[PDB]
């Protein structure tokens, strides 16, 4: 009936590094997706209270959104690029699981996922 707290985005006990793949994920992948016409429902955690989705978090136990991913990248929360990629994949899969295939949100997620894959296919070598 309430929203859960949003995912953690900062942790001073985790080691921190910057890598060229993590920089690409932030400056190319995240930035490109954020600017997309269909990004707005994905820029913050799903507000199941405001959107009147009382079962959202009864079904989705691993919420993820691009606002969280951005702040995780900015806080050097991720050590491996694959951690970040997994969060993007979780965000898309949540949307496909909760919603129905003809819903506008799913059409939006599919277009963003296509763009995501196009950018991930160009991920630079480490």
């Amino acid at each position: 009936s309430t929203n859960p707290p949003p995912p953690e985005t900062s942790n001073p006990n985790k080691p921190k590094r910057q890598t060229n793949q993590l920089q690409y994920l932030l400056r190319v992948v995240l930035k490109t997706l954020w600017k997309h016409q269909f990004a707005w429902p994905f820029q913050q955690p799903v507000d199941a209270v405001k959107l009147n989705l009382p079962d959202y978090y009864k079904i989705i136990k691993t919420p993820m959104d691009m606002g969280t991913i951005k702040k995780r990248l900015e806080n050097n929360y991720y050590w491996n690029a694959q951690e970040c990629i997994q969060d993007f994949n979780t965000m898309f899969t949540n949307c496909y699981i909760y919603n129905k295939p003809g819903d506008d949100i799913v059409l939006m997620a599919e277009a963003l996922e296509k763009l995501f894959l196009q950018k991930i296919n160009e991920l630079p070598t480490e």
Binding site: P41, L51, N52, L53, Y98, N99, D103, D104, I105, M108
Partner: peptide, 11 residues
């Protein structure tokens, strides 16, 4: 913005 949340957007 949503006409029906998730189902139909209005923008």
């Amino acid at each position: 913005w949503w006409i029906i949340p998730k189902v139909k957007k209005g923008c």
